Amino acid sequence: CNKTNDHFTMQPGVNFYTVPNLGPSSSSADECYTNPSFSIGSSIYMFSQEIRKTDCTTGEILSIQIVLGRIVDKGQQGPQASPLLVWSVPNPKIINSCAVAAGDETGWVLCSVTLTAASGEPIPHMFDGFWLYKFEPDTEVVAYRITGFAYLLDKVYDSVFIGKGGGIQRGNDLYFQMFGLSRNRQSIKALCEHGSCLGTGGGGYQVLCDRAVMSFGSEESLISNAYLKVNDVASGKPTIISQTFPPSDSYKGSNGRIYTIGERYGIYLAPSSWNRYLRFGLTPDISVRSTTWLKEKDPIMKVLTTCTNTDKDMCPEICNTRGYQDIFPLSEDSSFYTYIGITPSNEGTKSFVAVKDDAGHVASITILPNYYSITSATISCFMYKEEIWCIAVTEGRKQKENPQRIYAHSYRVQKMCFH
Amino acid sequence: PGCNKTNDHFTMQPGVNFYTVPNLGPSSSSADECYTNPSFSIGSSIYMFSQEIRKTDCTTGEILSIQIVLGRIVDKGQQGPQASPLLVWSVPNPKIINSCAVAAGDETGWVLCSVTLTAASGEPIPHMFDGFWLYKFEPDTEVVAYRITGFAYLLDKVYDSVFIGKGGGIQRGNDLYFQMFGLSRNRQSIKALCEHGSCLGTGGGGYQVLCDRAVMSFGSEESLISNAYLKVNDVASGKPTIISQTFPPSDSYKGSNGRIYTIGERYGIYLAPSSWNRYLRFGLTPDISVRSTTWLKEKDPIMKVLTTCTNTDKDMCPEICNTRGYQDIFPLSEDSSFYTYIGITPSNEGTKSFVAVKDDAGHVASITILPNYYSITSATISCFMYKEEIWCIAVTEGRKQKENPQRIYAHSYRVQKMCFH
């Protein structure tokens, strides 16, 4: 189909098939499965999950399970998951966060660690560098510790977390996103994009904007986002450099994702503050200056938020948002993308899946109607049986009584040529 | 339908014509005289034009004459806007002038020059500082001269040379603002701006050492080629004073000619590539302050001309090199999200150039200009409202014919509003 003259429609199919056994999962009520990462490669997929005790946010990290596997036909209607290796991150109590990336037959887990006490116990919310784990079918896991000998951040970070969305490989480099506390001696003017907001008073919402990026109310400590580059992975001596987004080009730092989009890249930034619209940029090279942000507002995070602002004007305020609902671009310009929306109910949440075009037409389909709640979504698509398919990995509870768990469902995107 | 609609984008473009603005400034045919370092400023009803006439060389030549023109932009009945000079005047003692630039206001004009130390022989000690001369120009009135030396100025570093940026400055009330670069005195550890693209070994401080050096002047921590805002205070006093506010090496590259702008009720600064960063250094400021200056993200124009830099336009990896152009911009929106400029690209013969408008979405709309000219090596552009349409004049150094000495050429064009998408 001549991409020049012919026109095209993209739509979510009718079915939302289970992809069981993408990762293992236990039945224990005492445990919560949280902060997944999912990256599909040319032939492999990588998946990470954190198993925490009691609390899904501050609960002790009992374990971080990594899965290397393959997406395959098992005869079933949709694509299925064949796990190749199941592995635990060692010394999980010292981990801040970990994310994954898939290449050809090679996966990566990048983990940011915190300072350990003399006692050996964690010094919470700090930064002792990184662990990079290299995963290859039927080969042993390889471990590269990245301390200050082999990493150079562009600010002084007291905490470093890896964006749960995961990363991408490009030649000999990997690309991930990070967030944490940087140290600032610069005056700030934070990004303050809202709609019709009629509250003047002192600097007003720009003062509120400036304050919502600070940690603990001091411009000396910002919660910041950064591109994280891993160089020279073929050497066995990888290094790590960072490019931090300044407050004028970002909201409060958050979990994010890096995307290969054609020969360029993209970046998702889950809301963490007052501005709960889609924060997705494109960049021909992974750099803060060449990053352009999409004018798309949907998905709008309307869940896991202490925010009280309207989705229509999103007026700034000091509030805390905790979700994750990325997109997967379906065209070179992200002109079409797919996403899951999640809306609060009087009891739980209700979700839809959607493909959206440049023009604001949305083809949505309600999903998981017999689930009690779904609270996150990371989606990765691929070619399978010569059709566009996606897997959406989603936290939630099939039953309210149940502990939080992570599920994978599959769906097709129909590409309709109109010749 | 007019643009009050949906999924539609307002944009701007240069027009099809590039009209000559003849006689904006005087010129001679002398084969051994170069016309260089022009300063152009357009006010409400007046225009200021400064130009250096040098002996043989355009860079290191003597200064046989610095001419000033006070004129008005008028409609003389031709297709585009025209220049009527009101006064042509020569800056006294050009030998000792480090550098001048102009500022236009409303029915009042300003020339600010920095002078160097005058030797006993007479010949100026080069690259030295001996104060400022501010000349006031006013229609149907004579030039008033104001010396600003000694305690009448207070620079915020110890500058061993001061140069007024040739871009020009503005008038805000009873005060005047200019850009200034020169060698200042530093004895402090510096981590200078090192923003580039993909470069091998970025982690490892190499490029940071090259960045740190590319601004060092005494070879190390004694002199830094720095930028500054220069404020002239109380021009109605008759005893105007000059204060400076210097950029730290963490907020600027090597110092260079720049320009101060009025942009609405806010302001702007252009800074020309002098070292390895050959992109756009344009900053926006609500007041004229280093702490309130935000640098645009957009990279065009990109000085590919008059440089010894062999780095790539795409990655701009820090190296030690020299760039000596001036291709500034004129903002066409409050946020400089829109703006017009000129781009110049080298050719094994000379240079090829184009006029362009950048939009709020990255798009560049360009028409090639001066095709029968051999070369065009600089560009300063000032716009204004003429016949209820946005018009700009561009003042460009070059050689229409190769064997001819450099002259200063001026042309007019229009910026049109359009909707697409």
DSSP assignment of B150-190, as one string?
A: GGGEE-SS-BS--EE-TTBBEEETTEEEEEEEEEEE--S--
Chain B residues inside the 8 Å CB shell of A231: 203
Q: Which helix (H) or strand (E) holds A130?
A: strand A130-135
Provide the sign of the torsion angle of the four alpha carbons A89, A95, A100, A106, taken in this order. negative
Q: Of B329, B332, B337, which Cα lies nearest the Cα of B389?
A: B332
What are φ and ψ of residue A23, in 5° steps? -140, 160
Cα separation, A130 vs A132, whole angstroms: 7
Write out the residues of chain B at the interface with chain A, using a CB-CB cutoff of 8 A. 7, 195, 197-198, 202-204, 291-292, 294, 297, 299, 314-315, 362
Distance of CA B258 to CAs A19, A259, B2, B313, B318, Å? Answer: 61, 39, 38, 21, 21
Q: How far is B291 from chain A (nearest CA, A)?
A: 7
User: How many whole angstroms separate alpha carbon B194 and alpha carbon B251?
Assistant: 10
Q: Is the omega angle on the peptide bond into residue A299 within 30 degrees of 0, that is, cis? A: yes
Report the CATH number that the domain containing residue B253 is assigned in CATH: 2.120.10.10
How close, in Å, is residue B215 to chain A by CA atoms? Answer: 20
User: Is B384 within a domain?
Assistant: no
Type of residue at B47: Y
| Residue B191: closest C-alpha in chain A | A154
Three-state SS at B208: helix
Q: Are strands B339-346 and B351-358 parallel, antiparallel or unpaired?
A: antiparallel
A149's torsion region: left (phi>0), alpha (psi -120 to 50) or beta?
alpha
Question: Of B279, B277, B282, which Cα lies nearest the Cα of B320?
Answer: B277
Q: How far apart are the first and last CA of chain A?
A: 7
Report how far residue A311's alpha carbon sits from residue A300's, in angstroms, rounded to the nearest whole number: 7
Within 8 A of B291 by CB-CB distance, chain A residues are: 187
B292 neighbourhood in chain A, CB within 8 Å:
187
ω into B405 cis (within 30 of 0)? no
Residues of B in contact with A292 (CB under 8 A): 362
Q: Which amino acid, B134?
A: L
Nearest to B177 by CA among B72, B281, B73, B290: B290
DSSP strand pairing (A349-356 vs A373-374)? unpaired
CA distance A8 to A370: 33
B340 within a domain of the structure (yes/no): no
Whole-angstrom Cα distance, residue A204 to residue A214?
Answer: 16
Q: Is residue B174 part of a domain?
A: yes
Question: Which of A189, A240, A285 is facing B197, going by the closest CB pair?
Answer: A285
Say whether A285 and B204 touch across the interface (CB within 8 A): no
Identify how the structure was determined: X-ray
Residue A363 domain boundaries: 7-418
| A109: β partners | A100, A133
Interface contacts A/B by beta carbons within 8 Å: 24
Cα–chain center distance at A73 = 27
Q: Which residues of A touch B7 (CB under 8 A)?
A: 359-360
Structure tokens at B352: 């090829």
Contact list, B315 vs chain A (CB under 8 Å): 285
CA of B361: which chain A residue's CA is closest? A292
B198: closest CA of chain A, how far (Å): 8
The Cα-based distances of B118 to B124, B128, B130 in angstroms read: 5, 9, 8
Complete edge-to-edge strand list for the sheet that includes strand B266-271: B258-263, B266-271, B281-285, B294-295
Q: Whole-angstrom Cα distance, residue B33 to residue B102? A: 22
Q: Does residue A179 sit within a domain?
A: yes
> Is residue B197 a contact partner of residue B278, using CB atoms and an 8 Å limit?
no
Contact B148, B241 (CB under 8 A): yes
Position B365 in a domain? no
Residue A153's closest chain B neighbor by CA?
B203
Q: Which of A152, A189, A285 sits opposite B203 (nearest CB)?
A: A152
- Under an 8 A CB cutoff, do B299 and A285 touch? no
* DSSP per-residue letters across A168-198: EEETTEEEEEEEEEEE--S--------SS--
What is the C-alpha to C-alpha distance for residues A106 and A134, in angstroms, rounded to an integer? Answer: 7
Is-contact A105 A66, C-beta < 8 A?
A: no
Taking CB atoms and an 8 Å cutoff, what residues of chain B touch A360? 7
Chain B partners of A285 at a C-beta cutoff of 8 Å? 197-198, 314-315
Amino acid at B354: F
- From the candidates A206, A231, A248, A289, which should be mutated to test the interface with B, based on the most B CB atoms within 10 A? A289
Q: Is A244 helix (H, G, I), strand (E, B) or coil?
A: strand
Task: State both tokens at B362.
Answer: 């990255």
Q: Mutating which of B194, B195, B298, B420 best tests the A interface, going by the most A Cβ atoms within 10 A? A: B195
Note whether residue B170 is domain-resident.
yes
Total residues found in chain A within this entry: 419
Please identify which residue in the block is written with the tokens 């603002």.
Answer: B177
d(CA B306, CA B329): 18
Of A231, A289, A359, the CB nearest to B195: A289
Longest distance between any two alpha carbons in chain B, whole Å:
72
Tally the domains of chain B.
1
Å between B286 CA and nearest CA of chain A: 12
Nearest by CB to residue A359, choosing from B7, B198, B291, is B7
- Bridge-based pairing of strands B241-246 and B153-154 is parallel
* Dihedrals phi, psi of A416, to nearest 5 degrees: -105, 115
8 Å CB contact between A109 and A169: no
Q: Nearest 5°: phi and psi at A213?
A: -95, -20
| Residue ranges in B19-94 assigned as alpha helix (H) | none
CB A356 within 8 A of CB A298: yes
- Between B204, B294, B314, which is nearest A189 by CB? B294
> Between chains, do B314 and A285 touch, taking CB under 8 Å as contact?
yes
Chain A partners within 8 Å of B295 (Cβ): none
A contact set with B (CB within 8 A): 151-152, 187, 189, 231, 239-241, 248-249, 285, 287, 289, 292, 359-360
User: Strands A239-244 and A151-152: what pairing?
Assistant: parallel
Residue A82 lies in a domain: yes
Tokens representing A416 are 């309709």
* DSSP count for chain B of H helices, then E strands: 1, 29
Residue B407 lies in a domain: no
Of A231, A239, A248, the CB nearest to B294: A248
Sign of CA dihedral A204, A205, A210, A214: positive
| Integer CA distances (angstroms), A361 to A274, A330, A382, B370, in order | 26, 15, 23, 46
Resolution in A: 2.8
Q: For residue B301, is the peptide bond before it cis, meaning its omega torsion is within 30 degrees of 0?
A: yes
Cβ B203–A287 below 8 Å, yes or no?
Answer: no
| SS3 (DSSP) at B206 | helix
A51's CB contacts (< 8 A; 6+ apart) are: A26, A31, A32, A33, A61, A62, A63, A64, A65
